[PDB]
Design a protein around this nucleic acid. Structure first.
Ligand SMILES: [Mg+2]
Ligand SMILES: [Mg+2]
Ligand SMILES: [Mg+2]
Ligand SMILES: [Mg+2]
Ligand SMILES: [Mg+2]
Ligand SMILES: [Mg+2]
Ligand SMILES: [Mg+2]
Ligand SMILES: [Mg+2]
Ligand SMILES: [Mg+2]
Ligand SMILES: [Mg+2]
Ligand SMILES: [Mg+2]
Ligand SMILES: [Mg+2]
Ligand SMILES: [Mg+2]
Ligand SMILES: [Mg+2]
Ligand SMILES: [Mg+2]
Ligand SMILES: [Mg+2]
Ligand SMILES: [Mg+2]
Ligand SMILES: [Mg+2]
Ligand SMILES: [Mg+2]
Ligand SMILES: [Mg+2]
Ligand SMILES: [Mg+2]
Ligand SMILES: [Mg+2]
Ligand SMILES: [Mg+2]
Ligand SMILES: [Mg+2]
Ligand SMILES: [Mg+2]
Ligand SMILES: [Mg+2]
Ligand SMILES: [Mg+2]
Ligand SMILES: [Mg+2]
Ligand SMILES: [Mg+2]
Ligand SMILES: [Mg+2]
Ligand SMILES: [Mg+2]
Ligand SMILES: [Mg+2]
Ligand SMILES: [Mg+2]
Ligand SMILES: [Mg+2]
Ligand SMILES: [Mg+2]
Ligand SMILES: [Mg+2]
Ligand SMILES: [Mg+2]
Ligand SMILES: [Mg+2]
Ligand SMILES: [Mg+2]
Ligand SMILES: [Mg+2]
Ligand SMILES: [Mg+2]
Ligand SMILES: [Mg+2]
Ligand SMILES: [Mg+2]
Ligand SMILES: [Mg+2]
Ligand SMILES: [Mg+2]
Ligand SMILES: [Mg+2]
Ligand SMILES: [Mg+2]
Ligand SMILES: [Mg+2]
Ligand SMILES: [Mg+2]
Ligand SMILES: [Mg+2]
Ligand SMILES: [Mg+2]
Ligand SMILES: [Mg+2]
Ligand SMILES: [Mg+2]
Ligand SMILES: [Mg+2]
Ligand SMILES: [Mg+2]
Ligand SMILES: [Mg+2]
Ligand SMILES: [Mg+2]
Ligand SMILES: [Mg+2]
Ligand SMILES: [Mg+2]
Ligand SMILES: [Mg+2]
Ligand SMILES: [Mg+2]
Ligand SMILES: [Mg+2]
Ligand SMILES: [Mg+2]
Ligand SMILES: [Mg+2]
Ligand SMILES: [Mg+2]
Ligand SMILES: [Mg+2]
Ligand SMILES: [Mg+2]
Ligand SMILES: [Mg+2]
Ligand SMILES: [Mg+2]
Ligand SMILES: [Mg+2]
Ligand SMILES: [Mg+2]
Ligand SMILES: [Mg+2]
Ligand SMILES: [Mg+2]
Ligand SMILES: [Mg+2]
Ligand SMILES: [Mg+2]
Ligand SMILES: [Mg+2]
Ligand SMILES: [Mg+2]
Ligand SMILES: [Mg+2]
Ligand SMILES: [Mg+2]
Ligand SMILES: [Mg+2]
Ligand SMILES: [Mg+2]
Ligand SMILES: [Mg+2]
Ligand SMILES: [Mg+2]
Ligand SMILES: [Mg+2]
Ligand SMILES: [Mg+2]
Ligand SMILES: [Mg+2]
Ligand SMILES: [Mg+2]
Ligand SMILES: [Mg+2]
Ligand SMILES: [Mg+2]
Ligand SMILES: [Mg+2]
Ligand SMILES: [Mg+2]
Ligand SMILES: [Mg+2]
Ligand SMILES: [Mg+2]
Ligand SMILES: [Mg+2]
Ligand SMILES: [Mg+2]
Ligand SMILES: [Mg+2]
Ligand SMILES: [Mg+2]
Ligand SMILES: [Mg+2]
Ligand SMILES: [Mg+2]
Ligand SMILES: [Mg+2]
Ligand SMILES: [Mg+2]
Ligand SMILES: [Mg+2]
Ligand SMILES: [Mg+2]
Ligand SMILES: [Mg+2]
Ligand SMILES: [Mg+2]
Ligand SMILES: [Mg+2]
Ligand SMILES: [Mg+2]
Ligand SMILES: [Mg+2]
Ligand SMILES: [Mg+2]
Ligand SMILES: [Mg+2]
Ligand SMILES: [Mg+2]
Ligand SMILES: [Mg+2]
Ligand SMILES: [Mg+2]
Ligand SMILES: [Mg+2]
Ligand SMILES: [Mg+2]
Ligand SMILES: [Mg+2]
Ligand SMILES: [Mg+2]
Ligand SMILES: [Mg+2]
Ligand SMILES: [Mg+2]
Ligand SMILES: [Mg+2]
Ligand SMILES: [Mg+2]
Ligand SMILES: [Mg+2]
Ligand SMILES: [Mg+2]
Ligand SMILES: [Mg+2]
Ligand SMILES: [Mg+2]
Ligand SMILES: [Mg+2]
Ligand SMILES: [Mg+2]
Ligand SMILES: [Mg+2]
Ligand SMILES: [Mg+2]
Ligand SMILES: [Mg+2]
Ligand SMILES: [Mg+2]
Ligand SMILES: [Mg+2]
Ligand SMILES: [Mg+2]
Ligand SMILES: [Mg+2]
Ligand SMILES: [Mg+2]
Ligand SMILES: [Mg+2]
Ligand SMILES: [Mg+2]
Ligand SMILES: [Mg+2]
Ligand SMILES: [Mg+2]
Ligand SMILES: [Mg+2]
Ligand SMILES: [Mg+2]
Ligand SMILES: [Mg+2]
Ligand SMILES: [Mg+2]
Ligand SMILES: [Mg+2]
Ligand SMILES: [Mg+2]
Ligand SMILES: [Mg+2]
Ligand SMILES: [Mg+2]
Ligand SMILES: [Mg+2]
Ligand SMILES: [Mg+2]
Ligand SMILES: [Mg+2]
Ligand SMILES: [Mg+2]
Ligand SMILES: [Mg+2]
Ligand SMILES: [Mg+2]
Ligand SMILES: [Mg+2]
Ligand SMILES: [Mg+2]
Ligand SMILES: [Mg+2]
Ligand SMILES: [Mg+2]
Ligand SMILES: [Mg+2]
Ligand SMILES: [Mg+2]
Ligand SMILES: [Mg+2]
Ligand SMILES: [Mg+2]
Ligand SMILES: [Mg+2]
Ligand SMILES: [Mg+2]
Ligand SMILES: [Mg+2]
Ligand SMILES: [Mg+2]
Ligand SMILES: [Mg+2]
Ligand SMILES: [Mg+2]
Ligand SMILES: [Mg+2]
Ligand SMILES: [Mg+2]
Ligand SMILES: [Mg+2]
Ligand SMILES: [Mg+2]
Ligand SMILES: [Mg+2]
Ligand SMILES: [Mg+2]
Ligand SMILES: [Mg+2]
Ligand SMILES: [Mg+2]
Ligand SMILES: [Mg+2]
Ligand SMILES: [Mg+2]
Ligand SMILES: [Mg+2]
Ligand SMILES: [Mg+2]
Ligand SMILES: [Mg+2]
Ligand SMILES: [Mg+2]
Ligand SMILES: [Mg+2]
Ligand SMILES: [Mg+2]
Ligand SMILES: [Mg+2]
Ligand SMILES: [Mg+2]
Ligand SMILES: [Mg+2]
Ligand SMILES: [Mg+2]
Ligand SMILES: [Mg+2]
Ligand SMILES: [Mg+2]
Ligand SMILES: [Mg+2]
Ligand SMILES: [Mg+2]
Ligand SMILES: [Mg+2]
Ligand SMILES: [Mg+2]
Ligand SMILES: [Mg+2]
Ligand SMILES: [Mg+2]
Ligand SMILES: [Mg+2]
Ligand SMILES: [Mg+2]
Ligand SMILES: [Mg+2]
Ligand SMILES: [Mg+2]
Ligand SMILES: [Mg+2]
Ligand SMILES: [Mg+2]
Ligand SMILES: [Mg+2]
Ligand SMILES: [Mg+2]
Ligand SMILES: [Mg+2]
Ligand SMILES: [Mg+2]
Ligand SMILES: [Mg+2]
Ligand SMILES: [Mg+2]
Ligand SMILES: [Mg+2]
Ligand SMILES: [Mg+2]
Ligand SMILES: [Mg+2]
Ligand SMILES: [Mg+2]
Ligand SMILES: [Mg+2]
Ligand SMILES: [Mg+2]
Ligand SMILES: [Mg+2]
Ligand SMILES: [Mg+2]
Ligand SMILES: [Mg+2]
Ligand SMILES: [Mg+2]
Ligand SMILES: [Mg+2]
Ligand SMILES: [Mg+2]
Ligand SMILES: [Mg+2]
Ligand SMILES: [Mg+2]
Ligand SMILES: [Mg+2]
Ligand SMILES: [Mg+2]
Ligand SMILES: [Mg+2]
Ligand SMILES: [Mg+2]
Ligand SMILES: [Mg+2]
Lengths: 59, 141, 72, 77, 189, 110
RNA sequence: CUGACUGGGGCCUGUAGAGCACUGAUAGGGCUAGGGGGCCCACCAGCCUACCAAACCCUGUCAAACUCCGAAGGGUCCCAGGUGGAGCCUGGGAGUGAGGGCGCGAGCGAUAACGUCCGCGUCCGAGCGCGGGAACAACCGAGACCGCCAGCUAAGGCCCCCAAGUCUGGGCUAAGUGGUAAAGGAUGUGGCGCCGCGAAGACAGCCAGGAGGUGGCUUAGAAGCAGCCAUCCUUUAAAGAGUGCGUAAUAGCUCACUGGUCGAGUGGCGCCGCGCCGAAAAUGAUCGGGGCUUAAGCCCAGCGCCGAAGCUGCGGGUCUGGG
RNA sequence: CGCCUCCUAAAAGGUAACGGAGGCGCCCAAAGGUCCCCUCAGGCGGGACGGAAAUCCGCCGGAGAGCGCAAGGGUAGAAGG
RNA sequence: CGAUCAACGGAUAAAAGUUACCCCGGGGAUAACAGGCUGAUCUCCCCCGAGCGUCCACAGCGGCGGGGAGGUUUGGCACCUCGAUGUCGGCUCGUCGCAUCCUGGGGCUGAAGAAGGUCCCAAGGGUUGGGCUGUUCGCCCAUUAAAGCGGCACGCGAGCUG
RNA sequence: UCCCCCGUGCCCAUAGCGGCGUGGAACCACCCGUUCCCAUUCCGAACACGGAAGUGAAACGCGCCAGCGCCGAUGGUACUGGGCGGGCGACCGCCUGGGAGAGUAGGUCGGUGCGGGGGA
């Protein structure tokens, strides 16, 4: 199981720890998509920035 | 009028007015009650004006229960001074009241009398109020 | 001193000061209508400290005048 | 108008300095406290100001003994 | 006398959703059972305003059962002054502690003199059998002057019902009335 | 509500337990005297001795001494050498003292 | 590879909330010291209470410097994910040590200030570059390497100024409310729910009566509109010992009330919706304008589109990295 | 105007204002070390002078006393006598 | 060992004032004027109807309390201006607001008439001369339909006065 | 490894208060003495020593009783990390994760380790 994570809302104005969560997920630009293994540590950061992000389950 | 006989501290920080009442939200003594719909600091002079209004309507007879007490000192700096130089002097006392509080209760009086007295009393208070009647819901508390 | 019988008159001062005197009023005169006793105080700068002295003196004249009509 | 208050003393930075499961060396201060809010347990000494400190190299362990108080122990490694 | 109230079982439905649908969430329990239930708010209100915590309410469950209950507890919305939850105590053949209405018979002599009858307790806490629940307990207050009082020791109890509060607990008092003639001394106090 | 006996017992014992030595506890009844060597870390008794178990007879003091010598002989058999004396609620004197002295004569270290 | 952030686990905490066991506050009862006022007395004992009122008890509450309780979180350590203009170490060079608005949490202030002082965060500062908000540093959208007469979106919008629906389904509002406010007042209007009264015929109109004992604590001469204590009953509808004009004397008119009428509903609560009043300040007005009323307003449910220097496409530069 | 205690301080630490309240500039040759022993305040009853409270007797009693002085923490299983 | 070096990280072993006779360098980082934000105070309007008004809550009043409006008072704050925004009063010249002093219209009156009181509409025009005082204001004289209250940098000193 | 008792721990009131009952063979206690060791700011009360006539009265042990004390759900709520909205404000909501205190039902007159002495 994997997660397709798309950054859809800008982190400008959001706390720096949410900005860091994006960095841990490797999301650096709007509309950028990353396919990450579904582990609890990755899921925790995806959930932290859920309001900025669009998630899909893949394969 | 109402104020503490003594206190540990002369002056209190202002604090906040969030939320519904902590307690005192059910009729506990009389047959009818005046319930607060909005939060406010209710002054001792407002309380007394409400009381006197009710005894004036009853003329003779009935019983009033005052369920709020102004124990919070109210502070004001002398007129025309600048900021600083310490906290202003105590000028009065207030009872903190939040939505749902039963502030006054009446008994020993007809429904028409209780409705009218509590209405007049409500006009002396800086908040919106509601008149209620003792219920099984109150008795179950 | 029941106020409904008071006519408070705020105007400008007279004499030493600065721009403050020319602009800031703070000259007070109260008038007790039932007795006709008037008092104006123009000592310190602020009218509130000028009204305080004006109030206490007005009552002092009200009492000294009634105590006259009583011992007369 | 003036104030007769305006005083306060320096903050004393009290509290637990090493939590349960931390690897300490002998002498490591474990708790700064006023009185015995924590009591010295196995391999833990107490100084004249109630400071708890490790007597041996080891691992910190806490224990709540009800009416007997809370204790701080060091478990040798 | 005895009231009936249709109840329904609930599992994971959110209390807010139920309450927005007009359903009053609740629970029913005793030493043997514990079930999450809900009742129609207006239907419950019609009953409870009569039954209160004094009279038996039997709940007609959807599985065909019918359990005799007393309301143990009603949680009120402090702001809106409305019920948000009910505890239904499922009765059984054992004696049970409960509140029994006090009915104040007579007009106190103090009341005739202008006083006011302060009804400190409008019910009394009691151990009794479910088969044995009286509807009220009469109290003769006509002897009370300003300011005399009655206590739970003065209660004449029907057969099979035992006081569950201290007999020292005061239950009624006749107090002096409000009087405008006192206002002036209070104002100049 | 504790008694002087209970407080005195806790007082002297707590002090002993802090040193972490094996604890030589002594119980003294009107007739008999008993001793057990206790590992308070495991909550277990290692070796025991008493006048009631040895069927000792005479003067209570000379008896106590004998139960002390007995406890020592068995203790050394287990390799128990160093110990800490738990007089409990008793003064270090008379029967308790005699038992202690008898334990020492046997080569118990304290 | 140790970083920010994240997962699991251990431990530390006394805030929100709440509570009243402690410290104090506290209303009303009970119970009862102490007084107070009255009784009988001074023979010193003896009785009253609706005065004040400790302790205690009950009901009911209040607290930054109260806590029997007590979260969400926060901190820290271990293992793990995390290769980032991350981190650690040693040196060279600094600049800054006037901040500011906003959100949340408090103090101060007046539950004032484009106020002030801290905490967490954020943005401007330095992003007065870009889209929206009429205009506008910090609100919303979004981090501008250059080029394009290409595409997709964000907030916001889609009647004309002005790019895109005079789009679709059901409501609400008549106030230009929308497009500037409160206590309070109102047969504005709409929607639920729950009780009265209805052919021994209702509500509303017309019609006939609407009485008799007839005074009291009782008086400033007023049985009934004078202040209370009053609420018995009766002349075979059965009509208050009384709500609106005369009254420190009487009329008379009137209801509630009863019958007589016509023939169909009528009245009372309670929750919600949207509107009316309250609503007066100084150069000329206006919601940005024009204009808008089954809307071009508000609520709900939809599909489409416009919309930026965000994203994509194409081409180019530069640095770093990987070949 | 330096130092201590409590609060403000937003449950780690720290955190400002001419914010809310109090203390310190000493003290003890024992009020220190160590052994040993002992347990308080208060309430009720009893009791010559003698009282609300001197000391004595009894019962009730987990700490509300004490710990040199402010406050807090701590404390009788003593840090108290 | 000698510190109220207590301004307590302690400039010298050793130290107070005054300046309208004043000076320079700076600051709108900071006050006095005006503005601005705020509206405590101020002015005005309401809600409640206790009681007054011989009788009668509301002709006229409105105990104790409650809600607002205005931005003319005194303040609070320190936001533009200290490489300058000239500050009172008078004169001249106006113009605006209406919470209206008069004049016009109207409702209630405890409106007989006349004359009043009070509230509603209404800003078209009008709103005198003089004594005192630097005065604004206020008192007084003689009149008047009336002798209104405010804004305009408490309008107006590149218009005057001083 | 079962029951009683005597030591000593652990959990830290579900273990406590009170009431009642029960136990002396053994053990423990009171008890009998104060010569001796040791002791009383006076007192053999305590501490201590030598004892064994008596009693389980006191204490302690073991049962029972829910008047008190203690413990205490399940529901629901407050509050809230994160995410959003509304109000001019005092303040009010929605989503997602967390989730009390009070109160109700109920529970409790203890459980357990080691070593002794005794009993089956
Ligand atoms: Mg964003
Ligand atoms: Mg970005
Ligand atoms: Mg943003
Ligand atoms: Mg965050
Ligand atoms: Mg964080
Ligand atoms: Mg981007
Ligand atoms: Mg998306
Ligand atoms: Mg504050
Ligand atoms: Mg106030
Ligand atoms: Mg204040
Ligand atoms: Mg000033
Ligand atoms: Mg201040
Ligand atoms: Mg103040
Ligand atoms: Mg006040
Ligand atoms: Mg309240
Ligand atoms: Mg009101
Ligand atoms: Mg309660
Ligand atoms: Mg002069
Ligand atoms: Mg001025
Ligand atoms: Mg001025
Ligand atoms: Mg001072
Ligand atoms: Mg201070
Ligand atoms: Mg200081
Ligand atoms: Mg500090
Ligand atoms: Mg500090
Ligand atoms: Mg501190
Ligand atoms: Mg700590
Ligand atoms: Mg250990
Ligand atoms: Mg040491
Ligand atoms: Mg020390
Ligand atoms: Mg552990
Ligand atoms: Mg309802
Ligand atoms: Mg790594
Ligand atoms: Mg790490
Ligand atoms: Mg880390
Ligand atoms: Mg983590
Ligand atoms: Mg709180
Ligand atoms: Mg309390
Ligand atoms: Mg309680
Ligand atoms: Mg509070
Ligand atoms: Mg509280
Ligand atoms: Mg606090
Ligand atoms: Mg608190
Ligand atoms: Mg708890
Ligand atoms: Mg936590
Ligand atoms: Mg953790
Ligand atoms: Mg790793
Ligand atoms: Mg690197
Ligand atoms: Mg960088
Ligand atoms: Mg960097
Ligand atoms: Mg360099
Ligand atoms: Mg260089
Ligand atoms: Mg610098
Ligand atoms: Mg520098
Ligand atoms: Mg500096
Ligand atoms: Mg600055
Ligand atoms: Mg600075
Ligand atoms: Mg700052
Ligand atoms: Mg600053
Ligand atoms: Mg802010
Ligand atoms: Mg918000
Ligand atoms: Mg604060
Ligand atoms: Mg600021
Ligand atoms: Mg602000
Ligand atoms: Mg503020
Ligand atoms: Mg900031
Ligand atoms: Mg700068
Ligand atoms: Mg920006
Ligand atoms: Mg930036
Ligand atoms: Mg910008
Ligand atoms: Mg800009
Ligand atoms: Mg632009
Ligand atoms: Mg912009
Ligand atoms: Mg724009
Ligand atoms: Mg535009
Ligand atoms: Mg802008
Ligand atoms: Mg860029
Ligand atoms: Mg498109
Ligand atoms: Mg537009
Ligand atoms: Mg177009
Ligand atoms: Mg649309
Ligand atoms: Mg259309
Ligand atoms: Mg409009
Ligand atoms: Mg409009
Ligand atoms: Mg309203
Ligand atoms: Mg009549
Ligand atoms: Mg009469
Ligand atoms: Mg309506
Ligand atoms: Mg209006
Ligand atoms: Mg209008
Ligand atoms: Mg439509
Ligand atoms: Mg575009
Ligand atoms: Mg780009
Ligand atoms: Mg390219
Ligand atoms: Mg490139
Ligand atoms: Mg680069
Ligand atoms: Mg702190
Ligand atoms: Mg703190
Ligand atoms: Mg802290
Ligand atoms: Mg914190
Ligand atoms: Mg001082
Ligand atoms: Mg000594
Ligand atoms: Mg000594
Ligand atoms: Mg005593
Ligand atoms: Mg006595
Ligand atoms: Mg005596
Ligand atoms: Mg005595
Ligand atoms: Mg103490
Ligand atoms: Mg002191
Ligand atoms: Mg020197
Ligand atoms: Mg000093
Ligand atoms: Mg200095
Ligand atoms: Mg100096
Ligand atoms: Mg110093
Ligand atoms: Mg210094
Ligand atoms: Mg320092
Ligand atoms: Mg020097
Ligand atoms: Mg020097
Ligand atoms: Mg020298
Ligand atoms: Mg000097
Ligand atoms: Mg000089
Ligand atoms: Mg001079
Ligand atoms: Mg001079
Ligand atoms: Mg001169
Ligand atoms: Mg000269
Ligand atoms: Mg010269
Ligand atoms: Mg000269
Ligand atoms: Mg010069
Ligand atoms: Mg110069
Ligand atoms: Mg210079
Ligand atoms: Mg210069
Ligand atoms: Mg300025
Ligand atoms: Mg400065
Ligand atoms: Mg200034
Ligand atoms: Mg200035
Ligand atoms: Mg100025
Ligand atoms: Mg000024
Ligand atoms: Mg100016
Ligand atoms: Mg100014
Ligand atoms: Mg300006
Ligand atoms: Mg201006
Ligand atoms: Mg303003
Ligand atoms: Mg205002
Ligand atoms: Mg305003
Ligand atoms: Mg005001
Ligand atoms: Mg108004
Ligand atoms: Mg009215
Ligand atoms: Mg009258
Ligand atoms: Mg009238
Ligand atoms: Mg009246
Ligand atoms: Mg008034
Ligand atoms: Mg107000
Ligand atoms: Mg202004
Ligand atoms: Mg002004
Ligand atoms: Mg000012
Ligand atoms: Mg101003
Ligand atoms: Mg100022
Ligand atoms: Mg300024
Ligand atoms: Mg400035
Ligand atoms: Mg500033
Ligand atoms: Mg300047
Ligand atoms: Mg220039
Ligand atoms: Mg210039
Ligand atoms: Mg210039
Ligand atoms: Mg110039
Ligand atoms: Mg003008
Ligand atoms: Mg007008
Ligand atoms: Mg006119
Ligand atoms: Mg006219
Ligand atoms: Mg007339
Ligand atoms: Mg006339
Ligand atoms: Mg006329
Ligand atoms: Mg008229
Ligand atoms: Mg009118
Ligand atoms: Mg009108
Ligand atoms: Mg006009
Ligand atoms: Mg005009
Ligand atoms: Mg005019
Ligand atoms: Mg004139
Ligand atoms: Mg002349
Ligand atoms: Mg003149
Ligand atoms: Mg003049
Ligand atoms: Mg002249
Ligand atoms: Mg003048
Ligand atoms: Mg004059
Ligand atoms: Mg004339
Ligand atoms: Mg005329
Ligand atoms: Mg001015
Ligand atoms: Mg002006
Ligand atoms: Mg002028
Ligand atoms: Mg001017
Ligand atoms: Mg001028
Ligand atoms: Mg000039
Ligand atoms: Mg001039
Ligand atoms: Mg000019
Ligand atoms: Mg000029
Ligand atoms: Mg000019
Ligand atoms: Mg000019
Ligand atoms: Mg001139
Ligand atoms: Mg001159
Ligand atoms: Mg045992
Ligand atoms: Mg027992
Ligand atoms: Mg027996
Ligand atoms: Mg027993
Ligand atoms: Mg025996
Ligand atoms: Mg026997
Ligand atoms: Mg001998
Ligand atoms: Mg003896
Ligand atoms: Mg003995
Ligand atoms: Mg014997
Ligand atoms: Mg016994
Ligand atoms: Mg014993
Ligand atoms: Mg049981
Ligand atoms: Mg509970
Ligand atoms: Mg729960
Ligand atoms: Mg939140
Ligand atoms: Mg807020
Ligand atoms: Mg939630
Ligand atoms: Mg949840
Ligand atoms: Mg909680
Ligand atoms: Mg709970
Ligand atoms: Mg128990
Ligand atoms: Mg045990
Ligand atoms: Mg164990
Ligand atoms: Mg065993
Ligand atoms: Mg055995």
């Amino acid at each position: 199981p994997r997660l397709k994570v798309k950054l859809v809302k800008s982190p400008i104005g959001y706390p720096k720890d949410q900005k860091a969560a994006l960095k841990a997920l490797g999301l650096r630009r709007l509309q950028q998509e990353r396919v990450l293994e579904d582990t609890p540590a990755i899921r925790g950061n995806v959930e932290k920035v859920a309001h900025l992000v669009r998630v899909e389950v893949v394969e | 009028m109402l104020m503490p006989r003594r206190m540990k501290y002369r002056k209190q920080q202002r604090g906040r007015l969030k939320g519904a009442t902590k307690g005192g939200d059910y009729v506990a003594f009389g047959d009818y009650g005046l319930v607060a719909l909005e939060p406010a600091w209710i002054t001792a002079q407002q309380i007394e004006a409400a009381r006197v209004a009710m005894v004036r309507h009853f003329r003779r007879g009935g019983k009033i229960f005052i369920r709020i007490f102004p124990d919070k000192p109210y502070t004001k700096k002398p007129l025309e001074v600048r900021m600083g130089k310490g906290k202003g002097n105590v000028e009065g006392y207030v009872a903190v009241v939040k939505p749902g509080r039963v502030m006054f209760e009446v008994a020993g009086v007809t429904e028409e009398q209780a409705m009218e007295a509590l209405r007049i009393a409500g006009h002396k208070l800086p908040i919106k109020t509601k008149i209620v009647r003792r219920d099984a819901y109150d008795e179950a508390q | 001193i029941n106020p409904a019988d008071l006519r408070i008159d705020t105007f400008r001062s007279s004499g030493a000061g600065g721009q403050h005197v020319n602009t800031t009023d703070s000259a007070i005169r109260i008038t007790h209508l039932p007795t006709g006793i008037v008092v104006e105080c123009q000592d310190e700068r602020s009218q509130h400290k000028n009204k305080a002295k004006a109030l206490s003196v007005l009552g002092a004249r009200i009492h000294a005048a009634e105590m006259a009509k009583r011992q007369q | 108008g003036s104030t007769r208050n305006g005083r306060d003393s320096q903050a004393k930075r009290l509290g637990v300095k090493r939590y349960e499961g931390q690897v300490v060396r002998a002498g490591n201060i474990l708790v700064r406290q006023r009185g015995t809010r924590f009591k010295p347990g196995k391999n833990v000494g107490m100084g004249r100001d109630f400071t708890l400190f490790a007597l041996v190299d080891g691992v910190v362990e806490f224990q709540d003994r009800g009416r007997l108080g809370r204790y701080v122990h060091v478990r040798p490694l | 006398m005895e009231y009936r109230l249709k109840a329904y079982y609930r599992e994971g439905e959110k209390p807010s959703a139920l309450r927005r649908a007009g359903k009053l969430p609740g629970v029913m329990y005793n030493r043997h059972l514990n079930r999450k239930v809900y009742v129609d708010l207006v239907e419950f209100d019609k009953v409870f305003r009569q039954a209160s915590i004094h009279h038996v309410i039997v709940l007609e469950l959807p599985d065909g059962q019918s359990l005799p209950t007393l309301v143990r507890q009603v949680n009120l919305d402090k702001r809106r002054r409305r019920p948000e939850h009910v505890d239904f105590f499922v009765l059984s053949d054992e004696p049970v502690e409960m509140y029994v209405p006090l009915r104040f018979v007579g007009t106190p002599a103090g009341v005739r003199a202008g006083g006011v009858l302060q009804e400190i307790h409008r019910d009394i806490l009691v151990k009794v059998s479910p088969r044995n629940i009286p509807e009220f307990i009469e109290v003769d207050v006509s002897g009370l002057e300003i300011g005399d009082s009655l206590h739970a020791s003065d209660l004449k109890l029907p057969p099979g019902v035992e006081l569950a509060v201290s007999p020292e607990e005061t239950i009624a008092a006749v107090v002096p009335p409000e009087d405008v003639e006192k206002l002036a001394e209070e104002a100049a106090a | 509500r504790l008694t002087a006996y209970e407080r005195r017992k806790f007082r002297v014992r707590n002090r002993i337990k802090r040193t972490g030595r094996l604890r030589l506890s002594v119980f003294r009844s009107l007739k008999h005297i008993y001793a057990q060597i206790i590992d308070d870390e495991k909550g277990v008794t290692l070796v025991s001795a008493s006048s009631l178990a040895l069927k000792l007879k005479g003067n209570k003091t000379e008896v106590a001494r004998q139960v002390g010598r007995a406890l020592a002989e068995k203790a050394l058999a287990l390799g128990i050498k160093q110990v800490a004396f738990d007089r409990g609620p008793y003064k270090y004197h008379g029967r308790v003292k005699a038992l202690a002295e008898g334990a020492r004569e046997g080569g118990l270290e304290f």
